[PDB]
């Protein structure tokens, strides 16, 4: 027994679109915000709840960018997302060009 390609992708939508939990691991994202910070002011410290408000804002941005990206792929007859889709969505919202 083995499902059809497609079956498990739609199973995952109905899962991660019902939970509200955080999707990136804590420590790997905590390392990233420190490295981006020390380029602007050396020997910072972060409050434990500051990095959470970064993460909860990032995930909510990424998830919104994908939701607006899929709209492009669907319009362009595909179902697969590809870089050329993100570059369109992100240009109409005025972020990058």
């Amino acid at each position: 027994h083995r499902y059809r390609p497609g079956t498990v992708a739609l199973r995952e939508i109905r899962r991660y679109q019902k939970s509200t939990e955080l999707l990136i691991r804590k420590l790997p994202f905590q390392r990233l915000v420190r490295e981006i910070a020390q380029d602007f002011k050396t020997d910072l410290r972060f409050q434990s709840s500051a990095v959470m408000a970064l993460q909860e804002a990032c995930e909510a941005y990424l998830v919104g960018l994908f939701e607006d990206t899929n709209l492009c792929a669907i319009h362009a007859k595909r179902v697969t997302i590809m870089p050329k889709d993100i570059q369109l969505a992100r240009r109409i919202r005025g972020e990058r060009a």
Binding site: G6, A9, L10, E12, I13, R15, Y16, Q17, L23, I24, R25, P28, F29, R31, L32, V33, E35, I36, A37, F40, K41, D43, L44, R45, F46, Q47, S49, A50, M52, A53, L54, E56, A57, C58, E59, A60, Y61, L62, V63, G64, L65, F66, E67, T69, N70, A73, V79, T80, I81, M82, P83, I86, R90
Partner: protein, 79 residues
Amino acid sequence: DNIQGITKPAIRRLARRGGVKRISGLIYEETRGVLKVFLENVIRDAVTYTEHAKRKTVTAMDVVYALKRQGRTLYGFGG
């Protein structure tokens, strides 16, 4: 490098919440680009509000005010 710890399956979860079925293998290294620039733009402001007040730890209110400035408000941590 620390940005590669935004692992491939994590991008898939974020994408799955957003409702996409099938993901080109080029989207992983491209999406990291948009997360890396987004963090760059709010940490500049958060460290600016920090340096203003002479303290040298970034608080939750600093990242709240930085996010508020750029039109990406969050209710949760202190409005």
